[PDB]
Amino acid sequence: MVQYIFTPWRNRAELLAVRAQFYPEHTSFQDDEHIRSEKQKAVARVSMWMQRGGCPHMVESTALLVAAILSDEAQGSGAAGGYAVRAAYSAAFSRFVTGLLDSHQDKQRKQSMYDVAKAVGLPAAFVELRHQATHEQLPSLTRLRSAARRALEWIWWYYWKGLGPVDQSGWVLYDEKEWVPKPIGIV
Amino acid sequence: MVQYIFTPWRNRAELLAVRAQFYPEHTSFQDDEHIRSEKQKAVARVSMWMQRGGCPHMVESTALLVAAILSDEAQGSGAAGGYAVRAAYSAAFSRFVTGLLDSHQDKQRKQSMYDVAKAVGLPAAFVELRHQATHEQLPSLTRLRSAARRALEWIWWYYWKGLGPVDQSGWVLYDEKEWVPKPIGIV
Amino acid sequence: MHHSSFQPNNSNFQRKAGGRLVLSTPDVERFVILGNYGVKVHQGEVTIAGATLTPIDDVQWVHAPHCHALPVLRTANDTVIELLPCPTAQGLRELARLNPLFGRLWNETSDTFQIIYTSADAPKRTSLRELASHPAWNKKISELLTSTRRKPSPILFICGPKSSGKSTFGRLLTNRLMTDRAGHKSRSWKPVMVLDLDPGQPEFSPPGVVSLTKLRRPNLAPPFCHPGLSFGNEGMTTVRMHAIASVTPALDPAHFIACARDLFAYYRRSASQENIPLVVNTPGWIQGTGLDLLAELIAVLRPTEVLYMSEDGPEETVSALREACASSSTIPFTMLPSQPSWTPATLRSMAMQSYFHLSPFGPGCEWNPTPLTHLCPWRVRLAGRPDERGVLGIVCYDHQYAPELVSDAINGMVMGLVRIEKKEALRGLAVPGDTPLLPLIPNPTGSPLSPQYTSLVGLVLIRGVSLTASNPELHLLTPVPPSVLHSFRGDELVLVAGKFDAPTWAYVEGLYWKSNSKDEVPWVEMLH
Amino acid sequence: MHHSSFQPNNSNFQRKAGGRLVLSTPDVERFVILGNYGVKVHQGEVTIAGATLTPIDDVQWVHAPHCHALPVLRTANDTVIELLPCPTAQGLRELARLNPLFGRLWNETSDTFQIIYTSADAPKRTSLRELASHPAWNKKISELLTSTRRKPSPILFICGPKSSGKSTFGRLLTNRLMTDRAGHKSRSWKPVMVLDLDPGQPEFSPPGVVSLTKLRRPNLAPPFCHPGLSFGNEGMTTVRMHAIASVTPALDPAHFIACARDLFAYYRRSASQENIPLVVNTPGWIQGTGLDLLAELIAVLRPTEVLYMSEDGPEETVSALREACASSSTIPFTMLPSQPSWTPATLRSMAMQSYFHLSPFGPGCEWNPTPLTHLCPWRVRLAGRPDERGVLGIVCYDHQYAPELVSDAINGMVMGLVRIEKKEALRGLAVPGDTPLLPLIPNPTGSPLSPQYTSLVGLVLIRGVSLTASNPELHLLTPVPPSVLHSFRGDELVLVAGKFDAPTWAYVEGLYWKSNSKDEVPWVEMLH
Ligand SMILES: Nc1ncnc2c1ncn2[C@@H]1O[C@H](COP(=O)(O)OP(=O)(O)OP(O)(O)=S)[C@@H](O)[C@H]1O
Ligand SMILES: Nc1ncnc2c1ncn2[C@@H]1O[C@H](COP(=O)(O)OP(=O)(O)OP(O)(O)=S)[C@@H](O)[C@H]1O
Ligand SMILES: [Mg+2]
Numbered sequence A, B: 001m002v003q004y005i006f007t008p009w010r011n012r013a014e015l016l017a018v019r020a021q022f023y024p025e026h027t028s029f030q031d032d033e034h035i036r037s038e039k040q041k042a043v044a045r046v047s048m049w050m051q052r053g054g055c056p057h058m059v060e061s062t063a064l065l066v067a068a069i070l071s072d073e074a075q076g077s078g079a080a081g082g083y084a085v086r087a088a089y090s091a092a093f094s095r096f097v098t099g100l101l102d103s104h105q106d107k108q109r110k111q112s113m114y115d116v117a118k119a120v121g122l123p124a125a126f127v128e129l130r131h132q133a134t135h136e137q138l139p140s141l142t143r144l145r146s147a148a149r150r151a152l153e154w155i156w157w158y159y160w161k162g163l164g165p166v167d168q169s170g171w172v173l174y175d176e177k178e179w180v181p182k183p184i185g186i187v
Numbered sequence C, D: 001m002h003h004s005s006f007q008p009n010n011s012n013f014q015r016k017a018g019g020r021l022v023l024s025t026p027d028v029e030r031f032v033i034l035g036n037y038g039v040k041v042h043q044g045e046v047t048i049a050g051a052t053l054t055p056i057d058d059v060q061w062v063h064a065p066h067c068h069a070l071p072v073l074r075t076a077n078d079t080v081i082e083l084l085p086c087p088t089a090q091g092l093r094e095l096a097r098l099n100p101l102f103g104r105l106w107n108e109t110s111d112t113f114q115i116i117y118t119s120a121d122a123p124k125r126t127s128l129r130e131l132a133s134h135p136a137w138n139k140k141i142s143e144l145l146t147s148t149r150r151k152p153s154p155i156l157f158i159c160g161p162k163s164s165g166k167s168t169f170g171r172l173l174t175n176r177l178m179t180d181r182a183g184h185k186s187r188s189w190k191p192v193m194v195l196d197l198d199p200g201q202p203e204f205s206p207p208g209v210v211s212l213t214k215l216r217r218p219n220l221a222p223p224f225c226h227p228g229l230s231f232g233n234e235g236m237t238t239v240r241m242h243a244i245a246s247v248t249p250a251l252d253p254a255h256f257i258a259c260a261r262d263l264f265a266y267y268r269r270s271a272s273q274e275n276i277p278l279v280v281n282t283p284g285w286i287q288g289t290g291l292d293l294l295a296e297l298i299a300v301l302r303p304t305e306v307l308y309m310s311e312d313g314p315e316e317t318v319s320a321l322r323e324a325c326a327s328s329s330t331i332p333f334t335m336l337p338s339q340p341s342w343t344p345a346t347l348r349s350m351a352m353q354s355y356f357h358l359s360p361f362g363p364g365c366e367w368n369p370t371p372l373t374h375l376c377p378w379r380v381r382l383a384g385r386p387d388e389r390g391v392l393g394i395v396c397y398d399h400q401y402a403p404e405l406v407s408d409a410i411n412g413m414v415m416g417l418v419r420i421e422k423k424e425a426l427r428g429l430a431v432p433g434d435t436p437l438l439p440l441i442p443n444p445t446g447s448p449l450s451p452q453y454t455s456l457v458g459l460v461l462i463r464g465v466s467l468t469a470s471n472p473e474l475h476l477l478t479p480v481p482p483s484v485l486h487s488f489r490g491d492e493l494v495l496v497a498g499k500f501d502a503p504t505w506a507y508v509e510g511l512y513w514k515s516n517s518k519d520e521v522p523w524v525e526m527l528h
């Protein structure tokens, strides 16, 4: 009965709900407010899942990207000065690319990053940006904005779309007479 | 006359002033306000220098770290949600470590990161964190806070302290009679 | 009778009576014995896995799991032994119905223990190692022992690179120091204390907990055959434990060293009167932060002798260690050989799973084979007063949480009951007030509760939180006996929730039991 | 007379008269000639670096810098040549007093040009290469030429990996297509247009600018010997330029391709009437984004023939190129050999420095050896009205700035005067109003001004901004003649400030001149 795969979410309804919150566009002043609110909550939720353990790399990367984008567009003395936002983007991006490439690799000695990248179907632009971002002088804000958004959509067509449709009286030993065996979690 | 080294600042007074703004502690509600204000301006200034070209790696790293720290401590609906800040830190840190190690390296084939790290005098903790941060599951907020602050002080004892003490009438061809040859920039 | 070769050797007349085996051997004879069995020598001298037994000694229960190196029994001249069957082992055996991993771990026969002969008595599709003591190891142990007998209470600091034999060697040291009985016209068995500073794969403790243990009888059993010990004669008792909620201390060095200090302190106090050596085994690092930790540990503890089980180790770590070791005025540092499957992860998991099934009370400790789901949880209240509520609150280590997330985040994981000794612990935290939401104790800093002021009272597994309409409460299940639980007034009791590595085995366990013996299980996704 | 061997060969009677050299050679004779010299054949046929000269042809000024491959002059039978001295070259020569890099770049003798013989006529501490045409290259050129003559206006797309010979080959193609004069009973010299899409190390343009050039005479001179051309017979004129403010287009592919379209459009228009081939040379990438750009370029331009100068290139790039090339219905793709110091950086810098010293008016263009500091800047006003102010504002590409920073940030760097043709350019930007602060034109997007609506009018160097008390103004210096500058009303003129790689040479230049001929210089730190 090896058909046991552990996930950190409670069930499929929780997983789908989060997906909805991240991408209101496909799933579908006050309107913008509500959207921002939901996105914040979604990010928080994903963070919790990460702590719990055993969370798909794609979900993590998605969370990161949305976090950066959300931070960037924030009026009200919270625009992070400029250099911060550029860092947030670079971090999320580098992690995302490194993850994908490392995962789909062979167990030979030293096969090249570009080869693997092409084989999986990842645009060479992303790989190039990754190499540049880490070593050769942190990218400009505009380039990061574009790359981030493209990355998000690509992720959607790679992972998330395959997850469904698109619509001392303080301690009292529990009474050994009115108890019924229920699984762990449910009340 | 090879004694010509190009810098992006105007002169030593500008360079020292920036240093002062970054570290009010050693150089020395309303007080906190003023300090935050100055730090913001300092970060902006450094960014400009970076664009101008030819800027020491240490200054860049310093700017990044201060940017992240500054973003983290911001009440007023600008606390960036949580996941953002953690990314900003990871980015600044990874860049800083990668820079130092890559610079002080030999022109042999494949000498190890740890060896170089020890030789330069960089605590193995930082290197370990770098490796973990990039690949193995983005670090917790607390660890990043501590590491960032330590990094800043270390940088101060490595670089910044060695920079001084511690206390159509729109186009009119300029009159060829009242002109005096001055260098580029001065008026 | 019973002839074979290459692994064991011939015995002689083996008289089976009432379920036990009386075997006589009139020459040096060595034989392996897989299973669960009690030894009670009648005449002569037998050496079993490090402990020498003679006529005037109580029965010793030995568990020999087919996973690790099966203990070998060597008898020195004309002796008669009586091998008894183990009772409590049957309860442990039944645990195989709740997780297939415990299935292939014992004798695949009928009785409790089956003697092993040449090559064909082995179980199917599984190899069968054997404990063998290198000449160096044995000689070194002899040297330490003779020195010890003419000195006071030595402290042995054992360390070295991963999978080298640190644990095995420690086992030998403990058993031999305890049981030795040289020229004194034997003696009695001199007690021995063990300090386990290995959160990763502990001993005498569940995973994720550091602890100090006091041993009277020999330790002839793996870690997953006695994780929890009767808190507070009795064989093995536990002095003090601390919850370092991780499986890799490299998340908060300060707390780790602090814990080390507190535990060693207590050791100092009790050791001072009745002379008793202390054997401490470290996690096992060589590069990075870990090496630094090892250095600091050597500095704080100031061990009499340091044993590095590598002899071909990296020059950097050996050098660093030698420097630190040399620094504390003088410290003998000697290197010893080593020797080159079940990964640490699975072993750790087994330890944890075993712990929760421990029954709430030669024998050592019974096991209750009924699944966790079927048990009756403890119903703790949450809206009371700060003195008649039950749990004082919930603290979090290395990671905070928003209010809404907390209920879903905590539920399901493993936590630890932490008893506050002196009020000087929660000084600085905004302790909740009587007043519906979980009494989360905000801790912006991140750092854990000071070790000098709080202690662990055994891990706790949450199985359901229902805080609605008018009665906030938690349903949690623990192995801790009711006696201790009731005697704490509720005010001095905080709940710590950290990492611990989510008890994945727990959820599935119910399903396995139901299927083997012969539905919207949260977190577990069935592949249909 | 004048005998030697291995590099040149004997001449015959060399009669020196009035400063020129009349040399007769009655056999195939090849000789190198370093320096600056004008050729004017009297009888016969001479082949010089790709162009065939005969009696009925005007004097051709040739600059042969000791840096690149010195042109070789081969004469085909009994001919008489007259080598004239170059005048304007003297002005260029004096530039060595403003930067030592231009010092070691010519004949280290007395006159303007010195013939070279066996090995000892070479200057000290410097090697001396030589242009040699491989048989393959020459044969291929012949094939293209014969095909061209019996067809209309072909488009040759030259590309390949770095340092392979793309530029050199292009030079050959241009010179031969232009001057060839096969069996038609010679002709006249058929014009040729060149499209330079190499921001990195351009030709007929300063660095950081893409441009379309129209050539009448042969191009026998490196890039740093004619960067700027008389905007708007005359030898070399410039049709249109665009400011891609970088030295690596991989900062905004969209703009780059857009520029390519606009320029090619104009080419299409002018080419349509008078048949004229177009030779385009690309930057030279193989991996990453660059390869994609090359693909798109091939698609948009639809070249008649593609030449890949590698023959041993990486399989990935060759394959990719072949796919793209094949896609546009049919496109002949042929590979050619190559062959394996002054790095691109320094060469680029030299180009830029040369540009600003160009005198404001096969000969070509004079050079003014007076340092930039000594010149008189142009005083442009900043607080006027949106029609009588001078510069409409300052835009920034790929990076924004706060108000305070801008004044210090802009000052010192290189920018570009951009003329607005149609008002449809600044549509979307919050254009400043008359009203003291610099009229910064906010551009949140980041993207540059559309190419279809704006053009570049030559780079500008800022030497001082003083916006205080009541008279905001800028002091800037450019090579652009006053005639064009005045004729633009001021309203249709925006200033673009991007990257360009800071003109480090500018600041130091004043100091060098003062010292060689024989104080708080900003940005330059003297090592004392
Ligand atoms: N001489 C030996 N005889 C029998 N088994 C041995 C011997 N030396 C090593 N082993 C085996 O080595 C394995 C590792 O034993 P340990 O003592 O746990 O080593 P370790 O380095 O403590 O492992 P970790 O990483 O600390 S959990 C065991 O399964 C033993 O069976
Ligand atoms: N057959 C040749 N004869 C003489 N010089 C040659 C020959 N082939 C290559 N070279 C040299 O090759 C060098 C590079 O010439 P280019 O034509 O600029 O190559 P390139 O690939 O265009 O360089 P970049 O990267 O594009 S600036 C020049 O300095 C030439 O002197
Ligand atoms: Mg071990």
Ligand SMILES: [Mg+2]
Residues within 6 Å of the ligand: D166, D167, D168, D201
């Ligand atoms: Mg070239």
